[PDB]
Design a protein around this ligand. Structure first.
Ligand SMILES: *[C@@H]1O[C@H](CO)[C@@H](O[C@@H]2O[C@H](CO)[C@@H](O[C@@H]3O[C@H](CO)[C@@H](O)[C@H](O)[C@@H]3O)[C@H](O)[C@H]2NC(C)=O)[C@H](O)[C@H]1NC(C)=O
Ligand SMILES: *[C@@H]1O[C@H](CO)[C@@H](O[C@@H]2O[C@H](CO)[C@@H](O[C@@H]3O[C@H](CO)[C@@H](O)[C@H](O)[C@@H]3O)[C@H](O)[C@H]2NC(C)=O)[C@H](O)[C@H]1NC(C)=O
Ligand SMILES: *[C@@H]1O[C@H](CO)[C@@H](O[C@@H]2O[C@H](CO)[C@@H](O[C@@H]3O[C@H](CO)[C@@H](O)[C@H](O)[C@@H]3O)[C@H](O)[C@H]2NC(C)=O)[C@H](O)[C@H]1NC(C)=O
Ligand SMILES: *[C@@H]1O[C@H](CO)[C@@H](O)[C@H](O)[C@H]1NC(C)=O
Ligand SMILES: *[C@@H]1O[C@H](CO)[C@@H](O)[C@H](O)[C@H]1NC(C)=O
Ligand SMILES: *[C@@H]1O[C@H](CO)[C@@H](O)[C@H](O)[C@H]1NC(C)=O
Ligand SMILES: *[C@@H]1O[C@H](CO)[C@@H](O)[C@H](O)[C@H]1NC(C)=O
Ligand SMILES: *[C@@H]1O[C@H](CO)[C@@H](O)[C@H](O)[C@H]1NC(C)=O
Ligand SMILES: *[C@@H]1O[C@H](CO)[C@@H](O)[C@H](O)[C@H]1NC(C)=O
Lengths: 369, 74, 369, 74, 369, 74
């Protein structure tokens, strides 16, 4: 299996399913009427829908109040070239939110990709986060970083009912914080013997996080995003994996966990940036070097896999392609060991493999012999 | 943060990150009241108020042809 | 072959090719002049370009008329701090469309990703759809759901000619409606014998639609989108496949069609949501359960592949990862059969395979023996 | 809609959907007339009309450096 | 290895790393103070940051000047319903840039995906391009096509310091122009013998460009974009490959470079559009034809791989799926040779392979025998 | 442009393109001065200036909860 290909697109489909299913409940006429009732005396109300889910209800009435109580008075007998243009500028202010919401729902056919300031003001976002069914620490973190709540939510049009526009906003509940996460990066590890090559590349790169007893692997780029020490992940985008999976970082050749790799008979040079440095796979045919934003090129790198620290350098290059290192502080450690690829005989290496357990590569060599 | 370079596999693992995991969705239903702008008519030709009102009416009408779930068969 | 990888990106490239090729015709100076002629007495005109394609021509002149007939009068001798600010507010209204079009074309270097209300108003979209070269039913469906026409089109800048801004909008013609479509979902099917595993996963998931005698497979997520019973697909994104391909849903082990699978020697637990339910692949190492938005957790699931109905549950979970089921109504049916994976001897299973015909997996087992 | 769970392969097929297939493109060429705003000059310092007009002129000029097909070599 | 999968997402991650690292330097309080100093007497200043990088500094003060010198005067004793509405319209004009910047940074949690006209006006973009550390020809090309500089940059929020909003814009430096590039397209090549099939497909499609002695392969769709004769690529998105890699276009069966292919035992019909034409892979089960926007269908195509010129046709179709050809001029040439796939015995062909060196396919056949 | 169809592999190569390669990033730091709008108060009820000013203040406040690098722990 290719875990990344299995997980791809799952979180987006699950989010839309979740939102569309609730929208189906809200779209009934007796549901809309109950909602309009609950908001008859207030601008905010908590309620439980017919299907048993609890939601926040908000009423936005400024444009109705301006139309009923100011605009309609001023237009006596269908005449609108009045000399009070305050009336005209006021309208243009009072309808901007509504007009913006219409643009966003028409452009996206009723499902926005995220939550504009017109779907939800900063004030309304703060109230919605404060009402979420989670604990105080989670709410505090979401409140103080609510732009990230915004980014990961979206909106759905329920419909137009009378002169009333009804839509729903799905806000992400970050109900688990400050459990351990870690990230694996890797680059091709190649061994050359007599101008032939045996290469492998770890295929389990990406984010891992623990939660309530399990480890979840997030194989795809869009599933997680960092802000300093914190990494925001969508649980629906991950695959639960055995805790034994951490052995691939320990004894990848010995372990009995199925550490996924790809293989090749020809080297690939490239740079895998890591949070505190870079891996540079430098093989025959290219030149690699590391540089400083201050003192220029430092040093050319030897062939093979080299690990560069963001305190050792500011840039690493392959030929002319420049990669800028991060400036994040943290401790770097080398865990020495003979590269697994150098235990291969390039003359007995299998055909190129994509996303196979590493022990099936060793099996392939011995069953060929 | 603590990064370990694993020489045996040309890989790194970096630890010390703290999770922020999306575990659920919270729903905030909005009702935006537009008011009775469709009983309002401007008979006296081009006006600033006329254009603003017509923006509002045509936006209100366009919005009903939008659907996130079922196809409109009118 | 990996059909998804072959089809990926094809529809977007074909759409841009189609649009850029027409833009090449329109961009000639004698083409622009003919277009300006045709619009000299009207705001809308149908025409045929030099290359033989038929197009709609629309003229937008409000801002020119305000500049020529109102603004220019009011600025006598280059003085603009006049006491009639109606003049200033009017200008700000009359130029907003133009200014918005410039933002959109500058941000995207001349090719917008879809059609804003400034490229094309609701009125202009309705006229363009009504002139399309297709039948009444197709036009009626597009008219009543024109936000979807909007979403799937885009715009291209032809250029600026004098004070005249010339651009083109490509509208999608949905020329075929209400032919049958169907969707295949799948999750890993694993058989365990003595703590070893043989697993497979169908690799033909996605949308299928018939049209004029053929079946088209849409392997990728962005190629199709549903609205109720209807699924909007871009034909350029699909692969034509034999009708015999439907046998993979019937006798996947017996058939002579090459039913594509991937294989593994280690289980993957996950949830594949289906329109009327969910498939839950639950294997050793995880706990799966189904829940109700009303009465909490219903039941833990047994190990293996389980099918859950959206009337049986509202949620399914793997460990703590929650998946919300849909609320779409429809009939659910089980087609019983021995899982193909359980006819495998985990001790004679091949190496992990990605996107291979299933009969090559059986071949692999018998030629190994 | 009718969903069938195929026990032999841990898969489902759901039928009953109706196609809406994009089969072609229709082209709607627009000509937006801006009018002769480049013969208009405001000599009397800061003005509301001056800023609106300058927005219009600078937007008009910026638009000619935009190209969807060929590189501009001026 | 699958080169496309290795390179995927690299350029976006490298760009964000580069931008975030600089933002870390700028975000220090003594860095912000130095920046405010340098701009105390001017609106534009070049400077070198504490970490040794050279940057442009720009000051935007219109809204402060209107607030200090006009608005504050007019509001004597906290009263704002003044009869001069010029004051109200002026404010609405003077704050629009600021309000737009806030929307963009709140929606994206501090990192915009590209550079709106509010982050950077056309005037400021031109000044920033003119100050870039590159040669005159590169700057001239960027200046005259600056919408493309805009598209490929982005913005980052440094923070709010007092009443001062501090952000940075990363502009792409196109420091190398007019070196040779070329593009490889391909479609499945199938040989049938006795109703069995042997198929292959080149897996090295995409853009190649030379620079300073090396050839870079850009395997992914989002890495390069054309405008006429010019193709804009991000160097961080490519893989350096041996010059010998061009032999795959010359003697793909003979060469010793590892020409990557995928294989199949069952045909795929499809259309690969090329800049000056199309490749049509037409096999049993489908009908393919070529058409003219003027005179309708020209001709049905024979089975096998056919190359169609954009002067031979305007459209090619597989069944009912239409593909529009380009209208770009250029010379077309056929380089005849026996298709490699027809040298295969379908009865001795291997199992389906994904992204393997072609010589390992021949090896597979002879070591099976 | 010159396209060659390679009959031996059902592929084409097209040559004659000219590169425009992104080789670096140039940084343009902006300081947008808003002015002291937070010492400004409107006591006389609804006003056009009041709403514009309140837009400005609430936008200014919202902007400080936005962060591109570190989590805000207040
Ligand atoms: C690869 O490295 C890992 C990590 O060091 C090895 O895992 C460790 O294996 C030892 C040996 O069995 C375990 O020690 C035992 O722990 C149990 C705990 O209940 C105890 O009853 C025993 O007396 C003994 O102390 C150790 O727990 C385990 N570590 C972890 C984190 O699971 C692994 O064995 C290595 N694999 C190979 C094939 O060498
Ligand atoms: C897998 O299942 C499919 C679907 O049930 C099987 O397809 C069916 O095969 C039968 C046997 O040949 C076909 O019946 C014949 O139909 C022709 C029609 O012209 C008629 O001349 C014969 O007298 C006979 O009735 C049937 O049409 C066909 N169904 C479809 C939809 O094509 C298939 O054979 C199964 N495969 C294996 C390997 O068992
Ligand atoms: C596949 O086709 C390519 C391209 O035509 C072949 O490359 C060419 O091989 C010849 C034979 O060795 C080279 O000629 C030699 O060039 C060197 C240059 O220093 C010279 O010292 C020799 O006397 C001789 O003239 C030629 O340079 C080379 N072309 C390129 C562009 O590298 C290749 O050999 C073919 N492969 C197979 C397996 O047939
Ligand atoms: C609208 O009218 C109310 C009184 O009915 C008044 O208090 C308010 O200030 C008015 N607003 C505008 C914008 O004219
Ligand atoms: C006002 O509008 C309502 C709702 O559209 C309509 O039913 C009614 O006939 C109108 N009547 C008056 C007096 O405005
Ligand atoms: C512009 O002038 C025409 C008469 O030439 C008049 O009918 C129209 O109302 C004016 N519009 C504005 C916005 O002043
Ligand atoms: C007005 O503008 C046109 C077009 O740019 C220009 O050719 C002409 O010289 C100008 N003349 C007057 C009288 O405004
Ligand atoms: C603001 O005041 C200055 C004089 O201090 C004046 O020159 C300028 O025109 C005024 N601007 C507005 C928009 O009132
Ligand atoms: C004005 O605002 C500044 C900055 O927020 C504040 O420190 C000061 O106390 C205020 N004073 C006056 C007189 O406005």
């Amino acid at each position: 299996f290719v875990l990344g290909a299995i997980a791809l697109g799952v979180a987006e489909a699950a989010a839309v399913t979740a939102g569309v299913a609730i929208a189906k409940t809200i779209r009934d006429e007796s549901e809309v009427t109950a909602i309009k009732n609950a908001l008859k005396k207030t601008n905010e109300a908590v309620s439980t829908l017919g299907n048993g889910v609890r939601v926040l209800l908000t009423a936005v009435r400024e444009l109705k109040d301006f139309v009923s109580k100011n605009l309609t008075r001023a237009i006596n007998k269908n005449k609108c070239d009045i000399p009070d243009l305050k009336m005209a500028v006021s309208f243009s202010q009072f309808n901007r939110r509504f007009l913006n919401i219409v643009r966003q729902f028409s452009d996206n056919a009723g499902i926005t990709p995220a939550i504009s300031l017109d779907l939800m003001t900063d004030a309304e976002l703060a109230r919605a986060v404060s009402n979420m069914p989670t604990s105080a620490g989670q709410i505090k973190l979401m409140l103080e970083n609510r732009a990230m709540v915004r980014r990961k939510g979206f909106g759905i049009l329920i419909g137009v009912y009378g002169s009333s526009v009804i839509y729903m906003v799905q806000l992400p509940i970050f109900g688990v914080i400050d459990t351990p996460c870690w990230i694996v990066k890797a680059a091709p590890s190649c061994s050359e013997k007599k101008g032939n090559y045996a290469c492998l590349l770890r295929e389990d790169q990406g984010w891992y996080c623990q939660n309530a007893g399990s480890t979840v692997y997030y194989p795809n780029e869009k599933d997680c995003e960092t802000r300093g020490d914190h990494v925001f992940c969508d649980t629906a985008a991950g695959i639960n994996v055995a805790e034994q999976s951490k052995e691939c970082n320990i004894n990848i050749s010995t372990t009995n966990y199925p550490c996924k790799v790809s293989t090749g008979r020809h080297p690939i040079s490239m740079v895998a940036l890591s949070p505190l440095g870079a891996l540079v796979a430098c093989y025959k045919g290219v030149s690699c070097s590391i540089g400083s934003n201050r003192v220029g090129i430092i040093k050319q790198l030897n062939k093979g896999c080299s690990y560069i620290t963001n305190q050792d350098a500011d840039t690493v290059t392959i030929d002319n392609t420049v990669y800028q290192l991060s400036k994040q502080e943290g401790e770097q450690h080398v865990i020495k060991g003979r590269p697994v690829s150098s235990s291969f005989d390039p003359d007995k290496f299998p055909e190129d493999q994509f996303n196979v357990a590493l022990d099936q590569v060793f099996e392939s060599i011995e069953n060929s012999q | 943060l603590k990064e370990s370079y694993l020489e045996e596999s040309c890989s790194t693992i970096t630890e010390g990150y703290l999770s922020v995991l999306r575990t659920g969705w919270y729903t905030n239903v909005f009702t935006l009241e537009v008011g009775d702008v469709e009983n309002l008519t401007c008979a006296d030709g081009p006006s600033l108020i006329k254009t603003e009102l017509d923006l509002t009416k045509s936006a209100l009408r366009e919005l009903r042809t939008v659907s996130a779930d079922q196809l409109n068969r009118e």
